[PDB]
Amino acid sequence: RQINTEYAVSLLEQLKLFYEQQLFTDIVLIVEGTEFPCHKMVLATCSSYFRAMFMSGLSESKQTHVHLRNVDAATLQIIITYAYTGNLAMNDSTVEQLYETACFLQVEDVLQRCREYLIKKINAENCVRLLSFADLFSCEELKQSAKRMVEHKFTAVYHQDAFMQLSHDLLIDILSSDNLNVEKEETVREAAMLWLEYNTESRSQYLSSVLSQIRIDALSEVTQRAWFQGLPPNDKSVVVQGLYKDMPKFFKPRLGMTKEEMMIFIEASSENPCSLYSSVCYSPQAEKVYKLCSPPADLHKVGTVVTPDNDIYIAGGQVPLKFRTVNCFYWFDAQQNTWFPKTPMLFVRIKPSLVCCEGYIYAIGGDSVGGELNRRTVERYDTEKDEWTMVSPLPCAWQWSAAVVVHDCIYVMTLNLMYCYFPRSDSWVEMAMRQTSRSFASAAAFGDKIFYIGGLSVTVEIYDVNKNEWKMAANIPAPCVRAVVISNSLCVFMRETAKYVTYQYDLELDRWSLRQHISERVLWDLGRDFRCTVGKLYPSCLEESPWKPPTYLFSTD
Amino acid sequence: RQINTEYAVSLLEQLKLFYEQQLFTDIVLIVEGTEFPCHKMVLATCSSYFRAMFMSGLSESKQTHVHLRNVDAATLQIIITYAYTGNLAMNDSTVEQLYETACFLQVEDVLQRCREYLIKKINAENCVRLLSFADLFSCEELKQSAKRMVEHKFTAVYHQDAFMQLSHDLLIDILSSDNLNVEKEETVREAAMLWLEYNTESRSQYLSSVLSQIRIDALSEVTQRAWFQGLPPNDKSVVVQGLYKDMPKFFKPRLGMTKEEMMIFIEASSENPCSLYSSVCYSPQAEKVYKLCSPPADLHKVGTVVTPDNDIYIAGGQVPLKFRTVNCFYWFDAQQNTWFPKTPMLFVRIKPSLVCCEGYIYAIGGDSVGGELNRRTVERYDTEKDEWTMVSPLPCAWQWSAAVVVHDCIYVMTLNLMYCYFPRSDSWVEMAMRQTSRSFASAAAFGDKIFYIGGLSSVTVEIYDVNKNEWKMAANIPAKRYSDPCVRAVVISNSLCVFMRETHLNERAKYVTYQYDLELDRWSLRQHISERVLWDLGRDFRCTVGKLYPSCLEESPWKPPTYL
């Protein structure tokens, strides 16, 4: 019928065998003294540059020796190896030079592969360098991705040396963007100052363009501090999602002045049957719920973890049988409301205990008991390296266990025992046991004390990290509880099968005070298996969908 | 790392794009005046001949114009097309010329594909021509396959013009081979006589080699008729598997002489835990059960057919879904005991009523597919053309119907009706209706009478006349009361018979065959099937009549005798 694949792979392997023994070599490429015999047809079919050079009919198609300059020998070898096979060795050490050589040779396949690899490899350490690279080589997709990454973590990357060596257009397009994740304009002002003072003799003429991009007369959230905070309870968030929108974009409050602390509920049951495992985030300050497009592959049984840098991650879980367990790792883009996948895990897990410790995210347990040494395995992920490293596994196989982090130390709790992990020692130490044997309990690290609340019957058990002793505090004022720390205060979001209400606990007085009721106006039944956490998100452009009539039960009579 | 092919499939089509627009043309091949610009690199990777002529470093690698002689321009274009795409578009008209061009250029890929294509193409017309073609080009695989086909139908292909033009070496191995399917030694003698008189001036010196290969003092089966037939009942068959088992191979009876009519049972139960649908045959003369291999590889619910030319085929069926219906079609080899495959059907089928009429095989019924479109699916197959064609469907959709052939007419029967198909008109004509409504019955043909026996079964026997178009009752199968006989009508020794497997209350299966009296309208006890062999075969077994090689098939009864 058409091109047969069975002969195609045989012809390709025969061409490779002929190239290895140097048969029918008609062209000789000279790169910085090194010689490479090759065929003109393969280079023409793979690279359009060689195609145009050979189809011109000039001496280049007649002379056997062609001198190629400004081309690395290793990159040319990788291009030619790929030209005779199809496997691309893309590593983080030589990806930029490979992309440069490909764009100089115009290999569409290699160009696209290197582009997508660089896009899936943008971290918080190379974002600025990759942005400069994309600007120099005019790659719009990589440029936009790196710009978004810089806008997401500007306050963390504006100290790097790559930021002070940026061009003028990059500076004026980064500073003018309203997506700068900064809590104060003073940070952007000091960034511009250090950029202009890095090289004064060449940037003394750009001081006007520098000062014209920093908002000085904005006065975003200081004007509210001048008059008063007099409003309905914590209605400063309404001004955030109101004044910001309607703004000439010159005095606009930057995106960093818009993030609000919201209770992130994932796998929260939804009235809509299609998405019975949806995810919504109720803002305690704005008193409003915001819809999330959280499920990237309509799956569930995934854990939640919020780093101190306010980053959301989900891992583990299983997709419906097209319920096969998977390894995908998803990071949430708080600006685009879309999860970008990462390097999959090494072992499949179901609701893994994900906690952030010393910049690493650890996957603890969260899987059905299979194999003595095969289970209880613990694995951590490197953020910048995008890799998974195995660590000392769990001492014993547990179920429905929780994990917290205090003082850069890992803690996992079980029925009545407790083990503390130290990354510096990579070992497990059994700690003070608990007087009660309970399951399905929720735990949240607050200050120097770990709170263990649950049991499936509620009892507030306080552990001291400094004393290694467990002391009883009280009971949850009531049961489906979710202990979460918000507003620098320990709280418990309890669901009374459904009624919703949040309580505040006093550590000194050992008393639980009513903090705020969550009227059934919105926040419908979220089920019982939903995972909860605390994080700051931009309500400005997250999602807007009430979905719930705040009034019902007509009283006309 | 792992070599990807998304780049190979793109590099290949990019090379074709340059070949069509004639870029990088470094060599021009001249064949009978026609020019064919191509690349020296591509021809070397496909053909080892060009690889040798280009890597020699001589003027052939430096001169752009190369004159290739004795090469067809049409076949060369196909070879070049294959080198740039990989799809070989072969046909029965230019396969022998393409193989000659391929072997002259020594293309391992084209030669292998053209070799297997010719093997699956050997019919009852090209066998002799392909045999001389294989010897001329020294293809040991095609030569052996073509030779076995000549030995199978030697009595039907020795009249072709290709047989008298065979070489001397091609004759000495055919006549000396003991696989000649001939009923009498005179056929081989006359076949050798017509060969030497075809060209006397060039074969007058080979008259001694011709007579030295034909067995004259053999006297295979003319000796048994001389003395007498005095033996246990029809034990002339035990002598067949005895004289041909020990002889100097010069006076051996040829394979054709070694033949026995056996009741072929396909999809029968197995004594040992094995294929639930096994295939075994019973020789009523040798009183021996032979085992048949099943290359179908666990086919289920298949049909059977035996042509008047003693050819066996199976079609349709279902295979266990790794059950799914397929359109497979296999031909049985009477000598190699295999089941070669043949051009599949157009539609998948289950137990089709396969019948042979005027040399054509027809697949009737067979697992109606697409009830909305049509249910009465039927199609014919040309053995020589190896092609399937749709024909006039049945007038109505029925189930568990039978099909027979009488006087070159295709008769299909149903619950109470019967339709006659005429291939000369390609239409269906309703015939006389049956008086009793019966299903799952057996059908048979003998002389001018069609027998629709069995069915609900019962012992009722219906005799239909083609010349009178009338259905009438004649007699009832004499069986024991309260028994459950699953009968199968079979015609053997030019006489209608019924292979009746009787299973009684608390008793094992009993097999027995009776003979019907046409003039007296009676059923006579013909032969009791020994229970020391022929173990239980179930009820869904298919049966037919055919001749096989007792000399060579697979003699393995095993069934342990003298029990209790």
PDB file of N, CA and C in Angstrom, chain A residues 27-64:
ATOM      1  N   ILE A  27      30.650  12.875   1.552  1.00  0.00           N
ATOM      2  CA  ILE A  27      31.000  14.196   2.061  1.00  0.00           C
ATOM      3  C   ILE A  27      31.855  14.031   3.308  1.00  0.00           C
ATOM      4  N   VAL A  28      32.721  15.013   3.544  1.00  0.00           N
ATOM      5  CA  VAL A  28      33.603  15.035   4.706  1.00  0.00           C
ATOM      6  C   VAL A  28      33.442  16.395   5.374  1.00  0.00           C
ATOM      7  N   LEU A  29      32.825  16.411   6.553  1.00  0.00           N
ATOM      8  CA  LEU A  29      32.637  17.640   7.310  1.00  0.00           C
ATOM      9  C   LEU A  29      33.835  17.864   8.227  1.00  0.00           C
ATOM     10  N   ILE A  30      34.397  19.070   8.169  1.00  0.00           N
ATOM     11  CA  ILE A  30      35.541  19.454   8.987  1.00  0.00           C
ATOM     12  C   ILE A  30      35.056  20.451  10.028  1.00  0.00           C
ATOM     13  N   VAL A  31      35.099  20.009  11.286  1.00  0.00           N
ATOM     14  CA  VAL A  31      34.709  20.892  12.418  1.00  0.00           C
ATOM     15  C   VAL A  31      35.938  21.006  13.316  1.00  0.00           C
ATOM     16  N   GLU A  32      36.457  22.207  13.538  1.00  0.00           N
ATOM     17  CA  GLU A  32      37.615  22.493  14.396  1.00  0.00           C
ATOM     18  C   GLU A  32      38.645  21.364  14.361  1.00  0.00           C
ATOM     19  N   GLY A  33      39.087  21.033  13.149  1.00  0.00           N
ATOM     20  CA  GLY A  33      40.124  20.049  12.943  1.00  0.00           C
ATOM     21  C   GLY A  33      39.648  18.615  12.856  1.00  0.00           C
ATOM     22  N   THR A  34      38.511  18.289  13.464  1.00  0.00           N
ATOM     23  CA  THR A  34      37.990  16.931  13.448  1.00  0.00           C
ATOM     24  C   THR A  34      37.248  16.665  12.147  1.00  0.00           C
ATOM     25  N   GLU A  35      37.460  15.474  11.594  1.00  0.00           N
ATOM     26  CA  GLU A  35      36.851  15.071  10.335  1.00  0.00           C
ATOM     27  C   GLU A  35      35.704  14.105  10.599  1.00  0.00           C
ATOM     28  N   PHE A  36      34.654  14.208   9.786  1.00  0.00           N
ATOM     29  CA  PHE A  36      33.498  13.319   9.883  1.00  0.00           C
ATOM     30  C   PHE A  36      33.040  12.948   8.479  1.00  0.00           C
ATOM     31  N   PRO A  37      33.272  11.712   8.049  1.00  0.00           N
ATOM     32  CA  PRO A  37      32.712  11.259   6.769  1.00  0.00           C
ATOM     33  C   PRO A  37      31.244  10.901   6.924  1.00  0.00           C
ATOM     34  N   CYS A  38      30.442  11.323   5.950  1.00  0.00           N
ATOM     35  CA  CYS A  38      29.004  11.104   6.015  1.00  0.00           C
ATOM     36  C   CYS A  38      28.421  11.144   4.609  1.00  0.00           C
ATOM     37  N   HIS A  39      27.135  10.814   4.530  1.00  0.00           N
ATOM     38  CA  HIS A  39      26.378  10.821   3.287  1.00  0.00           C
ATOM     39  C   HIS A  39      25.594  12.120   3.169  1.00  0.00           C
ATOM     40  N   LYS A  40      25.520  12.650   1.946  1.00  0.00           N
ATOM     41  CA  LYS A  40      24.786  13.891   1.725  1.00  0.00           C
ATOM     42  C   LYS A  40      23.280  13.684   1.835  1.00  0.00           C
ATOM     43  N   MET A  41      22.788  12.506   1.445  1.00  0.00           N
ATOM     44  CA  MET A  41      21.348  12.267   1.449  1.00  0.00           C
ATOM     45  C   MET A  41      20.787  12.273   2.863  1.00  0.00           C
ATOM     46  N   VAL A  42      21.491  11.647   3.807  1.00  0.00           N
ATOM     47  CA  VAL A  42      21.006  11.596   5.183  1.00  0.00           C
ATOM     48  C   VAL A  42      20.972  12.994   5.790  1.00  0.00           C
ATOM     49  N   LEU A  43      22.037  13.774   5.589  1.00  0.00           N
ATOM     50  CA  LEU A  43      22.067  15.133   6.116  1.00  0.00           C
ATOM     51  C   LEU A  43      21.012  16.014   5.461  1.00  0.00           C
ATOM     52  N   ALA A  44      20.704  15.771   4.186  1.00  0.00           N
ATOM     53  CA  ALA A  44      19.663  16.548   3.523  1.00  0.00           C
ATOM     54  C   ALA A  44      18.280  16.182   4.048  1.00  0.00           C
ATOM     55  N   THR A  45      18.032  14.891   4.273  1.00  0.00           N
ATOM     56  CA  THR A  45      16.726  14.465   4.766  1.00  0.00           C
ATOM     57  C   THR A  45      16.510  14.859   6.220  1.00  0.00           C
ATOM     58  N   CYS A  46      17.580  14.907   7.016  1.00  0.00           N
ATOM     59  CA  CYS A  46      17.446  15.238   8.429  1.00  0.00           C
ATOM     60  C   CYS A  46      17.466  16.739   8.683  1.00  0.00           C
ATOM     61  N   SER A  47      18.392  17.461   8.055  1.00  0.00           N
ATOM     62  CA  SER A  47      18.547  18.894   8.252  1.00  0.00           C
ATOM     63  C   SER A  47      18.237  19.623   6.954  1.00  0.00           C
ATOM     64  N   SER A  48      17.393  20.653   7.039  1.00  0.00           N
ATOM     65  CA  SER A  48      17.074  21.440   5.854  1.00  0.00           C
ATOM     66  C   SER A  48      18.248  22.308   5.423  1.00  0.00           C
ATOM     67  N   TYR A  49      19.157  22.626   6.349  1.00  0.00           N
ATOM     68  CA  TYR A  49      20.345  23.392   5.990  1.00  0.00           C
ATOM     69  C   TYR A  49      21.195  22.636   4.979  1.00  0.00           C
ATOM     70  N   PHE A  50      21.541  21.383   5.290  1.00  0.00           N
ATOM     71  CA  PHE A  50      22.304  20.576   4.348  1.00  0.00           C
ATOM     72  C   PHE A  50      21.521  20.331   3.066  1.00  0.00           C
ATOM     73  N   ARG A  51      20.195  20.223   3.162  1.00  0.00           N
ATOM     74  CA  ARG A  51      19.376  20.062   1.964  1.00  0.00           C
ATOM     75  C   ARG A  51      19.538  21.253   1.029  1.00  0.00           C
ATOM     76  N   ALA A  52      19.450  22.468   1.576  1.00  0.00           N
ATOM     77  CA  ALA A  52      19.632  23.661   0.756  1.00  0.00           C
ATOM     78  C   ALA A  52      21.068  23.793   0.265  1.00  0.00           C
ATOM     79  N   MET A  53      22.040  23.348   1.065  1.00  0.00           N
ATOM     80  CA  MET A  53      23.436  23.451   0.653  1.00  0.00           C
ATOM     81  C   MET A  53      23.766  22.479  -0.473  1.00  0.00           C
ATOM     82  N   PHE A  54      23.108  21.321  -0.507  1.00  0.00           N
ATOM     83  CA  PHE A  54      23.388  20.323  -1.531  1.00  0.00           C
ATOM     84  C   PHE A  54      22.548  20.524  -2.784  1.00  0.00           C
ATOM     85  N   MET A  55      21.302  20.974  -2.633  1.00  0.00           N
ATOM     86  CA  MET A  55      20.433  21.189  -3.783  1.00  0.00           C
ATOM     87  C   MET A  55      20.725  22.489  -4.518  1.00  0.00           C
ATOM     88  N   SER A  56      21.691  23.281  -4.051  1.00  0.00           N
ATOM     89  CA  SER A  56      22.041  24.514  -4.746  1.00  0.00           C
ATOM     90  C   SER A  56      22.810  24.255  -6.033  1.00  0.00           C
ATOM     91  N   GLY A  57      23.371  23.059  -6.198  1.00  0.00           N
ATOM     92  CA  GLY A  57      24.102  22.728  -7.404  1.00  0.00           C
ATOM     93  C   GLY A  57      25.443  23.408  -7.558  1.00  0.00           C
ATOM     94  N   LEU A  58      25.974  24.006  -6.496  1.00  0.00           N
ATOM     95  CA  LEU A  58      27.250  24.702  -6.560  1.00  0.00           C
ATOM     96  C   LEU A  58      28.382  23.744  -6.199  1.00  0.00           C
ATOM     97  N   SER A  59      29.562  24.303  -5.905  1.00  0.00           N
ATOM     98  CA  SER A  59      30.717  23.476  -5.572  1.00  0.00           C
ATOM     99  C   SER A  59      30.522  22.727  -4.261  1.00  0.00           C
ATOM    100  N   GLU A  60      29.579  23.170  -3.426  1.00  0.00           N
ATOM    101  CA  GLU A  60      29.325  22.473  -2.169  1.00  0.00           C
ATOM    102  C   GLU A  60      28.779  21.074  -2.406  1.00  0.00           C
ATOM    103  N   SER A  61      28.031  20.879  -3.493  1.00  0.00           N
ATOM    104  CA  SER A  61      27.559  19.549  -3.853  1.00  0.00           C
ATOM    105  C   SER A  61      28.603  18.752  -4.623  1.00  0.00           C
ATOM    106  N   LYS A  62      29.687  19.393  -5.053  1.00  0.00           N
ATOM    107  CA  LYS A  62      30.749  18.721  -5.791  1.00  0.00           C
ATOM    108  C   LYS A  62      32.004  18.490  -4.964  1.00  0.00           C
ATOM    109  N   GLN A  63      32.325  19.394  -4.043  1.00  0.00           N
ATOM    110  CA  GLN A  63      33.507  19.239  -3.205  1.00  0.00           C
ATOM    111  C   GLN A  63      33.208  18.283  -2.059  1.00  0.00           C
ATOM    112  N   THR A  64      34.136  17.359  -1.805  1.00  0.00           N
ATOM    113  CA  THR A  64      33.938  16.361  -0.763  1.00  0.00           C
ATOM    114  C   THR A  64      34.242  16.892   0.632  1.00  0.00           C
TER     115      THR A  64
END
